[PDB]
Short mmCIF file of all heavy atoms in Angstrom, two decimals:
data_model
loop_
_atom_site.label_atom_id
_atom_site.label_comp_id
_atom_site.label_asym_id
_atom_site.label_seq_id
_atom_site.Cartn_x
_atom_site.Cartn_y
_atom_site.Cartn_z
N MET A 1 1.46 -25.07 23.61
CA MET A 1 2.65 -24.73 22.80
C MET A 1 2.25 -24.40 21.36
O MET A 1 2.32 -25.27 20.48
CB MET A 1 3.66 -25.88 22.81
CG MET A 1 4.25 -26.14 24.18
SD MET A 1 5.41 -27.53 24.19
CE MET A 1 4.30 -28.89 23.81
N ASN A 2 1.85 -23.16 21.12
CA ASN A 2 1.45 -22.72 19.79
C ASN A 2 1.97 -21.31 19.50
O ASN A 2 2.05 -20.48 20.41
CB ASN A 2 -0.08 -22.75 19.65
CG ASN A 2 -0.65 -24.13 19.91
OD1 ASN A 2 -0.78 -24.95 19.00
ND2 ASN A 2 -1.00 -24.40 21.17
N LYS A 3 2.30 -21.05 18.25
CA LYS A 3 2.81 -19.75 17.85
C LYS A 3 2.13 -19.27 16.57
O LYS A 3 2.78 -18.75 15.66
CB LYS A 3 4.33 -19.81 17.64
CG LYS A 3 4.77 -20.86 16.63
CD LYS A 3 6.26 -20.82 16.40
CE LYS A 3 6.68 -21.81 15.33
NZ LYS A 3 8.15 -21.79 15.09
N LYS A 4 0.81 -19.44 16.49
CA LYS A 4 0.04 -19.03 15.33
C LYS A 4 -0.41 -17.58 15.46
O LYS A 4 -0.34 -16.81 14.50
CB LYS A 4 -1.16 -19.94 15.13
CG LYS A 4 -0.82 -21.31 14.56
CD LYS A 4 -0.06 -22.16 15.56
CE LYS A 4 0.31 -23.52 14.98
NZ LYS A 4 1.18 -23.39 13.78
N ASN A 5 -0.86 -17.21 16.66
CA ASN A 5 -1.32 -15.86 16.91
C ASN A 5 -0.38 -15.13 17.88
O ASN A 5 -0.45 -13.90 18.02
CB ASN A 5 -2.74 -15.88 17.49
CG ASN A 5 -2.80 -16.57 18.83
OD1 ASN A 5 -2.65 -15.94 19.88
ND2 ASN A 5 -3.03 -17.88 18.81
N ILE A 6 0.48 -15.89 18.54
CA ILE A 6 1.42 -15.33 19.49
C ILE A 6 2.73 -14.95 18.80
O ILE A 6 3.62 -15.78 18.63
CB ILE A 6 1.72 -16.33 20.63
CG1 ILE A 6 0.43 -16.81 21.28
CG2 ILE A 6 2.64 -15.68 21.66
CD1 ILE A 6 0.63 -17.91 22.30
N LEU A 7 2.84 -13.68 18.42
CA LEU A 7 4.05 -13.18 17.76
C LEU A 7 5.21 -13.15 18.74
O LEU A 7 5.01 -13.05 19.96
CB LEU A 7 3.81 -11.78 17.19
CG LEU A 7 2.88 -11.73 15.96
CD1 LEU A 7 1.43 -11.92 16.37
CD2 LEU A 7 3.06 -10.41 15.22
N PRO A 8 6.46 -13.23 18.24
CA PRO A 8 7.65 -13.19 19.07
C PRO A 8 8.09 -11.79 19.42
O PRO A 8 7.26 -10.87 19.52
CB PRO A 8 8.70 -13.90 18.21
CG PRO A 8 8.28 -13.69 16.81
CD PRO A 8 6.81 -13.34 16.81
N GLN A 9 9.39 -11.60 19.62
CA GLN A 9 9.94 -10.30 19.96
C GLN A 9 9.84 -9.33 18.80
O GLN A 9 10.28 -8.19 18.88
CB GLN A 9 11.39 -10.46 20.43
CG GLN A 9 11.56 -11.36 21.63
CD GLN A 9 10.85 -10.84 22.87
OE1 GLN A 9 10.38 -11.61 23.71
NE2 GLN A 9 10.76 -9.51 22.99
N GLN A 10 9.24 -9.82 17.73
CA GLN A 10 9.07 -9.02 16.52
C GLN A 10 8.04 -7.93 16.72
O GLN A 10 8.38 -6.78 16.95
CB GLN A 10 8.68 -9.92 15.36
CG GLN A 10 9.80 -10.84 14.90
CD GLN A 10 11.08 -10.11 14.61
OE1 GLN A 10 11.08 -8.93 14.22
NE2 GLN A 10 12.21 -10.78 14.82
N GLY A 11 6.76 -8.29 16.61
CA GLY A 11 5.69 -7.31 16.79
C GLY A 11 5.61 -6.35 15.64
O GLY A 11 4.87 -5.36 15.68
N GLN A 12 6.39 -6.63 14.59
CA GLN A 12 6.43 -5.78 13.41
C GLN A 12 5.08 -5.70 12.71
O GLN A 12 4.62 -4.61 12.36
CB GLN A 12 7.50 -6.31 12.46
CG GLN A 12 8.75 -5.45 12.41
CD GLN A 12 9.79 -5.96 11.43
OE1 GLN A 12 9.46 -6.59 10.43
NE2 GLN A 12 11.06 -5.71 11.73
N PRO A 13 4.41 -6.84 12.49
CA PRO A 13 3.11 -6.91 11.82
C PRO A 13 1.98 -6.34 12.66
O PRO A 13 0.87 -6.16 12.19
CB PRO A 13 2.91 -8.42 11.56
CG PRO A 13 4.23 -9.05 11.86
CD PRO A 13 4.86 -8.17 12.91
N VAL A 14 2.30 -6.07 13.92
CA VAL A 14 1.33 -5.50 14.83
C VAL A 14 1.23 -3.99 14.59
O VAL A 14 0.26 -3.35 14.94
CB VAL A 14 1.70 -5.75 16.30
CG1 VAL A 14 0.64 -5.19 17.24
CG2 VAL A 14 1.89 -7.24 16.55
N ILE A 15 2.28 -3.45 13.96
CA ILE A 15 2.33 -2.03 13.64
C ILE A 15 1.81 -1.78 12.24
O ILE A 15 1.31 -0.70 11.93
CB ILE A 15 3.77 -1.50 13.74
CG1 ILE A 15 4.52 -2.19 14.90
CG2 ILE A 15 3.77 0.02 13.91
CD1 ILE A 15 3.92 -1.89 16.27
N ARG A 16 1.90 -2.81 11.41
CA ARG A 16 1.43 -2.73 10.04
C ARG A 16 -0.09 -2.92 10.02
O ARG A 16 -0.81 -2.21 9.32
CB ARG A 16 2.07 -3.82 9.18
CG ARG A 16 3.46 -4.19 9.65
CD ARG A 16 4.15 -5.12 8.66
NE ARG A 16 3.35 -6.32 8.39
CZ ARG A 16 3.26 -6.89 7.20
NH1 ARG A 16 3.90 -6.37 6.16
NH2 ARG A 16 2.52 -7.99 7.04
N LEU A 17 -0.53 -3.87 10.81
CA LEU A 17 -1.94 -4.19 10.93
C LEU A 17 -2.71 -3.01 11.53
O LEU A 17 -3.79 -2.67 11.06
CB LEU A 17 -2.14 -5.42 11.81
CG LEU A 17 -3.53 -6.06 11.75
CD1 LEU A 17 -3.81 -6.61 10.36
CD2 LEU A 17 -3.63 -7.17 12.79
N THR A 18 -2.14 -2.42 12.56
CA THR A 18 -2.76 -1.28 13.22
C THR A 18 -3.04 -0.16 12.23
O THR A 18 -4.20 0.07 11.87
CB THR A 18 -1.84 -0.74 14.34
OG1 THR A 18 -1.67 -1.73 15.36
CG2 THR A 18 -2.42 0.51 14.95
N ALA A 19 -1.99 0.50 11.77
CA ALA A 19 -2.13 1.59 10.81
C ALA A 19 -2.68 1.06 9.49
O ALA A 19 -3.11 1.83 8.64
CB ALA A 19 -0.80 2.29 10.60
N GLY A 20 -2.66 -0.26 9.34
CA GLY A 20 -3.16 -0.88 8.14
C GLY A 20 -4.66 -0.84 8.05
O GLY A 20 -5.23 -0.57 7.00
N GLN A 21 -5.30 -1.13 9.18
CA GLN A 21 -6.77 -1.13 9.25
C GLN A 21 -7.32 0.26 8.95
O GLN A 21 -8.30 0.41 8.22
CB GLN A 21 -7.23 -1.60 10.62
CG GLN A 21 -8.74 -1.82 10.72
CD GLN A 21 -9.17 -2.27 12.10
OE1 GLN A 21 -10.29 -1.97 12.54
NE2 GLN A 21 -8.31 -3.01 12.79
N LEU A 22 -6.70 1.27 9.54
CA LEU A 22 -7.13 2.65 9.36
C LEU A 22 -6.83 3.12 7.94
O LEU A 22 -7.66 3.76 7.31
CB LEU A 22 -6.43 3.57 10.37
CG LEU A 22 -6.97 3.50 11.80
CD1 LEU A 22 -8.45 3.81 11.86
CD2 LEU A 22 -6.69 2.12 12.42
N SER A 23 -5.64 2.79 7.45
CA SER A 23 -5.24 3.17 6.10
C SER A 23 -6.00 2.38 5.07
O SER A 23 -5.81 2.54 3.86
CB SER A 23 -3.74 3.00 5.92
OG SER A 23 -3.33 3.37 4.61
N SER A 24 -6.88 1.51 5.55
CA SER A 24 -7.70 0.68 4.68
C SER A 24 -9.03 1.36 4.45
O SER A 24 -9.58 1.34 3.34
CB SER A 24 -7.91 -0.70 5.30
OG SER A 24 -8.61 -1.55 4.41
N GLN A 25 -9.57 1.95 5.51
CA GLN A 25 -10.85 2.65 5.46
C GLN A 25 -10.73 3.90 4.58
O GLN A 25 -11.73 4.48 4.17
CB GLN A 25 -11.31 3.03 6.87
CG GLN A 25 -11.74 1.84 7.70
CD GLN A 25 -12.18 2.25 9.10
OE1 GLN A 25 -11.37 2.30 10.03
NE2 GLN A 25 -13.48 2.52 9.26
N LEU A 26 -9.49 4.30 4.32
CA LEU A 26 -9.23 5.48 3.49
C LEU A 26 -8.91 5.07 2.07
O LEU A 26 -9.23 5.79 1.12
CB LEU A 26 -8.09 6.30 4.08
CG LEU A 26 -8.16 6.51 5.58
CD1 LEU A 26 -6.83 6.99 6.13
CD2 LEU A 26 -9.27 7.49 5.93
N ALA A 27 -8.25 3.92 1.93
CA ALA A 27 -7.90 3.41 0.61
C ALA A 27 -9.11 3.46 -0.31
O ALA A 27 -9.04 3.92 -1.44
CB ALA A 27 -7.34 2.00 0.71
N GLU A 28 -10.23 2.95 0.20
CA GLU A 28 -11.47 2.93 -0.53
C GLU A 28 -11.84 4.32 -1.03
O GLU A 28 -12.37 4.49 -2.14
CB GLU A 28 -12.61 2.36 0.31
CG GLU A 28 -12.52 2.84 1.73
CD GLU A 28 -13.55 2.18 2.63
OE1 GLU A 28 -14.69 2.68 2.72
OE2 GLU A 28 -13.20 1.17 3.26
N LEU A 29 -11.57 5.32 -0.20
CA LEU A 29 -11.86 6.70 -0.54
C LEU A 29 -10.56 7.47 -0.76
O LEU A 29 -10.42 8.62 -0.33
CB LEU A 29 -12.69 7.37 0.57
CG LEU A 29 -14.19 7.07 0.54
CD1 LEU A 29 -14.82 7.53 -0.75
CD2 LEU A 29 -14.45 5.59 0.78
N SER A 30 -9.62 6.81 -1.42
CA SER A 30 -8.32 7.39 -1.70
C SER A 30 -8.44 8.84 -2.15
O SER A 30 -9.17 9.17 -3.07
CB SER A 30 -7.60 6.58 -2.78
OG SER A 30 -6.33 7.13 -3.07
N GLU A 31 -7.70 9.72 -1.47
CA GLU A 31 -7.72 11.14 -1.78
C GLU A 31 -7.13 11.40 -3.17
O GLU A 31 -5.95 11.15 -3.42
CB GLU A 31 -6.94 11.94 -0.73
CG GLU A 31 -7.51 11.81 0.66
CD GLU A 31 -7.30 10.44 1.28
OE1 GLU A 31 -6.21 10.21 1.82
OE2 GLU A 31 -8.23 9.61 1.21
N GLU A 32 -7.98 11.88 -4.09
CA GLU A 32 -7.54 12.17 -5.45
C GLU A 32 -6.98 13.59 -5.55
O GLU A 32 -7.71 14.52 -5.90
CB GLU A 32 -8.71 12.00 -6.42
CG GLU A 32 -9.26 10.59 -6.44
CD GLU A 32 -10.52 10.47 -7.28
OE1 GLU A 32 -10.39 10.26 -8.51
OE2 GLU A 32 -11.63 10.58 -6.72
N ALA A 33 -5.70 13.74 -5.23
CA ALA A 33 -5.05 15.05 -5.29
C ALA A 33 -3.53 14.90 -5.34
O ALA A 33 -2.91 14.51 -4.35
CB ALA A 33 -5.46 15.89 -4.09
N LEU A 34 -2.95 15.21 -6.50
CA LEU A 34 -1.51 15.12 -6.68
C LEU A 34 -0.94 16.44 -7.18
O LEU A 34 -0.55 17.27 -6.34
CB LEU A 34 -1.17 13.99 -7.66
CG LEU A 34 -1.63 12.60 -7.23
CD1 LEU A 34 -1.38 11.59 -8.34
CD2 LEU A 34 -0.95 12.15 -5.96
#
């Protein structure tokens, strides 16, 4: 009976983490163009 890594019906942070990891490898090399 644990809910530390087992997310509920939410799964919201599972979508942030996903695109988050990829958007992280780019952050370092943030595109300088505005």
